[PDB]
Design a protein around this motif. Sequence first.
Motif, short mmCIF file in Angstrom:
data_model
loop_
_atom_site.label_atom_id
_atom_site.label_comp_id
_atom_site.label_asym_id
_atom_site.label_seq_id
_atom_site.Cartn_x
_atom_site.Cartn_y
_atom_site.Cartn_z
N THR A 18 7.21 5.44 7.01
CA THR A 18 6.90 6.89 6.96
C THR A 18 8.22 7.79 6.58
N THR A 19 9.38 7.29 6.96
CA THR A 19 10.64 7.74 6.21
C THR A 19 11.03 7.32 5.27
N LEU A 20 10.61 6.18 4.64
CA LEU A 20 10.54 5.78 3.25
C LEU A 20 9.54 6.51 2.34
N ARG A 21 8.45 6.89 3.10
CA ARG A 21 7.59 7.92 2.36
C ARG A 21 8.47 9.12 2.25
N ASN A 22 9.12 9.48 2.86
CA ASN A 22 9.71 10.71 2.56
C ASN A 22 11.37 10.44 2.20
N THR A 23 11.50 9.35 1.31
CA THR A 23 12.59 9.27 0.70
C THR A 23 12.21 8.59 -0.86
N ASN A 24 13.18 8.35 -1.67
CA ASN A 24 12.72 7.93 -2.94
C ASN A 24 12.79 6.37 -3.29
N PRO A 25 11.49 5.72 -3.44
CA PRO A 25 11.28 4.23 -3.28
C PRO A 25 11.62 3.77 -4.75
N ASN A 26 12.99 3.52 -4.84
CA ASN A 26 13.39 2.75 -6.00
C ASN A 26 13.29 1.26 -5.54
N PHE A 27 12.24 0.66 -6.25
CA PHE A 27 11.77 -0.57 -6.05
C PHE A 27 12.41 -1.71 -6.94
N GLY A 60 0.44 0.05 -12.50
CA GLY A 60 1.78 0.72 -12.19
C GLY A 60 2.27 1.18 -13.59
N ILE A 61 2.04 0.32 -14.63
CA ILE A 61 2.39 0.69 -15.86
C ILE A 61 1.39 1.61 -16.39
N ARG A 62 0.30 1.31 -16.40
CA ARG A 62 -0.98 2.26 -16.87
C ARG A 62 -0.70 3.86 -16.52
N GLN A 68 0.75 -1.12 0.04
CA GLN A 68 0.00 0.04 -0.16
C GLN A 68 0.85 1.29 -0.03
N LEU A 69 2.21 1.16 0.35
CA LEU A 69 3.06 2.31 0.15
C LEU A 69 3.07 2.59 -1.24
N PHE A 70 3.63 1.53 -2.21
CA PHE A 70 3.52 1.72 -3.58
C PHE A 70 2.37 2.40 -4.13
N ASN A 71 1.04 1.85 -3.87
CA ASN A 71 -0.13 2.36 -4.36
C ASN A 71 -0.22 3.99 -4.18
N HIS A 72 -0.29 4.37 -2.82
CA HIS A 72 -0.37 5.55 -2.40
C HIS A 72 0.70 6.67 -3.13
N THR A 73 1.88 6.27 -3.06
CA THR A 73 2.92 6.83 -3.97
C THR A 73 2.67 7.20 -5.34
N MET A 74 2.12 6.05 -6.06
CA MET A 74 2.19 5.81 -7.43
C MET A 74 0.85 6.11 -7.95
N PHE A 75 -0.33 6.05 -7.39
CA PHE A 75 -1.67 6.11 -8.11
C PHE A 75 -2.34 7.67 -7.56
N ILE A 76 -2.78 7.66 -6.32
CA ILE A 76 -3.63 8.59 -5.57
C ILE A 76 -2.89 9.88 -5.72
#
Lengths: 49, 48, 146, 125
Positions: free
Chosen positions: D17-26, D58-60, A4-12
Amino acid sequence: KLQQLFNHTMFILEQEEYQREGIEWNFIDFGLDLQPCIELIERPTNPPG
Amino acid sequence: EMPPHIYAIADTAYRSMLQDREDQSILCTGESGAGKTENTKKVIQYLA
Amino acid sequence: IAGASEQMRNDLLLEGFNNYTFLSNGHVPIPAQQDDEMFQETLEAMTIMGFTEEEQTSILRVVSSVLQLGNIVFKKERNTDQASMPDNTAAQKVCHLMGINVTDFTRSILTPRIKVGRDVVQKAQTKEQADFAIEALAKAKFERLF
Amino acid sequence: FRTVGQLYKEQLTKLMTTLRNTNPNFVRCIIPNHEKRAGKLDAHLVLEQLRCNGVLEGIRICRQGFPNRIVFQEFRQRYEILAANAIPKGFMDGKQACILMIKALELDPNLYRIGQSKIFFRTGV
């Protein structure tokens, strides 16, 4: 939880900003709040998981 | 200049941080066996 | 703005009177002094004190980037409320006379990758938060200059 | 105040939530088979893990919009050197002035999105 991190970052939040800037892009929803399974484990209030 | 493979994510972390200067992170996802442990250790080899 | 020679009129980035918002009352004239020539005078006076061949234009630039900052207008983008900045010559003509980092001026002026506690904290700034801080920057550069 | 369940939501929040405030290279790893095998793919197991990883969508999004986002000054400075003639005698708005060196370096009207504040930048640009 990472999912859900992924989702919130990348859709909404993305398309929210797309409304904002004056830039041409119309809103699409994807149905990608996976929060319902994550709720089903993790949601403290409401009906808890 | 370098085709889709891991050392591109690894430079892009070190590069961007000194550029756009977002504090950068790396998170590997997907089920068991998939390959995550090892695409973490290889990054420690890179920075060293 | 007045005694600009056409080369440094486009180098030190001069638009005309009242193209700066931070110069109020339009252009108020002064009695018995005409700013026009008083420019040329002070430039001589520099060379007499020994203000260097390039340095003269550098003092004049810092001034003019201060003159510049007030084109940076924040319009209430009212779907965060954490609103940001339309024009770029507003910052551009500022930051070519600054030479800081162009990316990072506005990316600071909009997203403070700042500090709460003793670590890195991100926030978008509001319309309000963005205006007031940039204002301080405009004026503070003239003080650093003096 | 906290439990394990909670602690580990929170340890994963010290993270998340510090991940939230960093760049998530997945680095999104995908299983071909549950049979530990060399060679063996299953396209429906993968298609399950695509719906699971939220791939197609995620692609769309990232086909549509513009991943990056920054303002127009990153244009005017770093490249005036690239095209010495571009802005000639006289200057105007930052958008239009950068648009001078932009078209003098052929920068495409949908590669960028010169917005209000931000140039939204697509992949690559």
